[PDB]
Amino acid sequence: TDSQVLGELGETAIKKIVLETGFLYEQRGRLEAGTDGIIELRDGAPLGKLLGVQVKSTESGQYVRENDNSFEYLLKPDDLKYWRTSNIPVIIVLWRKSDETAYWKDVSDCVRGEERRLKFDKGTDVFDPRSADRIGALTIDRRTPGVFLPPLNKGEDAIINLLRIRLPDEIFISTSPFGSGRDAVPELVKHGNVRFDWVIRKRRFVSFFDPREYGTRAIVDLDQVEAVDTKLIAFNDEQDDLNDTMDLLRRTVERQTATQLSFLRKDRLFHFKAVGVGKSRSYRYMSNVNETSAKVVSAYSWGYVRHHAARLRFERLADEWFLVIDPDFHFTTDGFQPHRYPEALLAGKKRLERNAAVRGQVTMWQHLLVESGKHEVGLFDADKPAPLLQFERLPVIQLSQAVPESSWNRTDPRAKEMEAQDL
């Protein structure tokens, strides 16, 4: 916006004089025809005293009064302080781009009203580095009870777990002579050309692939093998069909991610498999357009092998299926045998539950799931069928207000603890 650029130029100028004086400058949010921020005293150290500043920027146009010696400006109630909640004192600095000069007065009274008439004198008050003693004097300490640190009005974005699922338009449904899938697994392993991405509940067989063509012929009644719209099974209100839909979504995810993942019935946990006994291994994915690496299997040596894991859950939102990524870990003694006493290792996972590390795990897990459904030549079509489910990322969730992070790594003593230190 034209207004944002002018406000950026204004605060940049004001930041220069402020730093020239010896104080500090940070920005909070964005006004109309200007931007705002905070200024902190320094002696070589931030001293914990802070002042607000309102940087109004105009490119041309004289102020109200005769500009020979003085001037007048009016403060709109809406452009008035958003710091009304906070108890810090604030100044206002009027900077004209064409004259390249500013003047500061005290606007500590900001409650909305017709207090708009502001009386400025060019001689008495100018924002020069020379006004430093005055600016510093008008200061309430951060260490006073009641000082709000108001959140950033800048705005920021964030990602969500969900991966949109693109189901095949048709689902094969058929009756089964067997009761449950587990009852039919014995007969299936005998014939050959066997896949396990199918569900048999209450004598009903469902799968996206044709049962007649991939050796599931024995576990189904071929007579009533028939195709049907996927919305008739997935997008209904029948709890039995929602349960069968979620079971078929899991078993298909297992097949498509079988190259890099193994499924554990205990806690329904997917984890990165191991390739060598007591041997670490890494995974290369894509975070946005950046090439990354993650030690998904870390072997430690008195022996524990940690595996990157995640609970893959399925949630339906407004006639649209999504996959939830919930990252955790899976510990093994030798890369395969589960740890005989996994209770001692659970504490280390809590130190690894910080925002940046979970965001990276979700971003990684999305890349594996998205690639599993991709139609390309780089699949193992030799001896293995092609993926039928595809997964789509979601737009970034846009937040109106942002976390004052850059300000908090200075002020907040416990900021480093927000970082995830491994072992």
């Binding site: 969500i160 859950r313 939830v324 976390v403 416990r414 927000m418």
Partner: protein, 465 residues
């Protein structure tokens, strides 16, 4: 579909003589409690060793003189206590009257800590402490609240440690004294924070905030109101009714329904309903349409008997989904009641859906995502008032699913849930995860499982804290 987002303001509170502020501690410092009367005193009874009683009186006197902060860089999170004098935040004198003290001999402590069986020592400890509690309440002291300052050796004997198979001392004690009208606060005799509610660490400095929480609990347990939630319209008033289940240990392990009604002043009412049904193998508890009607009718009659104002909107809350029979009975009781507006909300504490910003600090408290018909509310996270994230682990958000029978929007309801998390009987820290009805359900259910089904239980929530 891509979803929408909103960041709620920290829901505002009202203190003395119309004062408004978001933090309970500052609002009490700037305006006092809601409706104070001239000369309020909270007569505080004490039970413990001779050392623990003297230590409590010292901490109370220290509290009156004031305790400056212990972390000046996070002053709104670690404030100083201004003292119980001119700047008395509660405008209420805290005194231990003569005779309200009961002492436990050094032998009796050794008699409990000498029993090898845990369950046997728990019962013997309750029989001891409950009998002394009965002596105070049925005596000339006439206390408003009683403090249980147990010695370190006795606490370390009755409380488990960490880093339904056995009895918990606090829950058994609450159940055995749920008929006495004087509440009880259990405190460690060193830091004077709460004890026996959560397991202790294997091995035992905030001091002013320890004092803030203790006085706040005593103020609430005495029967006074520090503040109330400020409504969007002053005349329309909302009441909140949670519904929970607790499973019994003996007999046939049958689930039992409970109701945790709260008004806008933070005062609760605890009602016990009929035995619940189960979907599969004694799990997944639910209520039939008739019994769900009786529970709501009983709660509204309890509301009408105490609060003496007409509730305009009644928000019903549950942690399990509203089954068809349950919603039908709630509608029948609500329609016969005359409540103009009603809302049903299924609060999912354990949803795996979350959002992650780019940084180390988590998202702001009050962040809300409108997944179509399903709200993702972040009751914990970064707090601008506190200037940090008041935790360590990543906050996991609440997922709010309003029922089709609801009147208000999902936005009107998430703003309601965020407000219900400010109500706290534990601390003076306002970034609590669960709303007041849900937080009480975990608590009364733990206590009522030791009061036999059929026995009438008190509705005053103060006896459960």
């Amino acid at each position: 579909m891509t979803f929408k987002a909103h960041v709620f303001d920290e829901p505002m509170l009202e203190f003395g003589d119309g004062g408004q502020h978001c933090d309970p501690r500052q609002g009490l410092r700037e305006h006092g409690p809601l409706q104070p009367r001239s000369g309020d005193v909270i007569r505080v009874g004490v039970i413990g060793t001779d050392d623990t009683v003297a230590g409590f009186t010292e901490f109370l006197a220290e509290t009156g003189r004031g305790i400056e902060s212990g972390n000046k860089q996070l002053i709104n999170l670690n404030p100083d206590f201004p003292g119980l004098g001119n700047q008395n935040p509660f405008r209420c004198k805290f005194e231990v009257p003569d005779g309200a003290t009961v002492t436990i001999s050094r032998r009796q402590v050794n008699d409990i800590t000498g029993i090898g069986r845990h369950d046997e020592a728990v019962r013997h400890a309750v029989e001891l402490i409950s009998s002394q509690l009965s002596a105070l309440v049925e005596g000339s002291a006439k206390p408003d609240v009683i403090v249980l300052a147990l010695p370190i050796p006795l606490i370390e004997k009755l409380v488990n440690a960490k880093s339904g198979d056995m009895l918990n001392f606090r829950d058994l004690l609450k159940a055995k004294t749920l008929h006495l009208p004087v509440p009880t606060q259990i405190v460690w005799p060193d830091t004077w924070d709460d004890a026996a509610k959560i397991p202790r660490k294997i091995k035992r400095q905030v001091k002013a905030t320890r004092a803030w929480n203790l006085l706040n609990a005593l103020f609430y347990k005495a029967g006074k109101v520090p503040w109330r939630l400020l409504p969007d319209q002053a005349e329309y008033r909302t009441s909140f009714l949670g519904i929970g289940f607790y499973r019994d240990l003996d007999g046939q392990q049958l689930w039992t329904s409970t109701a945790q009604m709260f008004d806008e002043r933070g005062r609760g009412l605890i009602l016990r309903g009929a035995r619940a049904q189960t979907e599969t193998r004694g799990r997944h508890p639910y209520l039939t349409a008739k019994d769900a009607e009786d529970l709501v009718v009983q709660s509204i009659a309890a509301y009408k008997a105490h609060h003496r104002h007409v509730p305009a909107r009644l928000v019903v809350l549950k942690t399990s989904r509203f089954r068809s029979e349950e919603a039908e009975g709630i509608d029948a009781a609500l329609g016969k009641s005359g409540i103009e507006m009603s809302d049903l909300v299924w609060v999912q504490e354990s949803s795996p859906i979350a959002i992650f910003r780019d940084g180390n600090y988590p998202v702001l408290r009050g962040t809300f995502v409108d997944l179509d018909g399903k709200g993702l509310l972040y009751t914990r996270g970064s707090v601008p008032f506190y200037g940090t994230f008041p935790g360590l682990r990543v906050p996991r958000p609440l997922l709010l699913v309003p029922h089709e029978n609801s009147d208000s929007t999902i936005l009107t309801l998430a703003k309601d849930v965020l407000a219900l998390t400010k109500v706290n009987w534990n601390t003076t820290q306002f970034d609590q995860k669960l709303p007041a009805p849900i937080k009480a359900a975990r608590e009364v259910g733990r206590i009522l499982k030791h009061v036999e089904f059929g026995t009438a239980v008190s509705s005053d929530f103060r006896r459960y804290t």
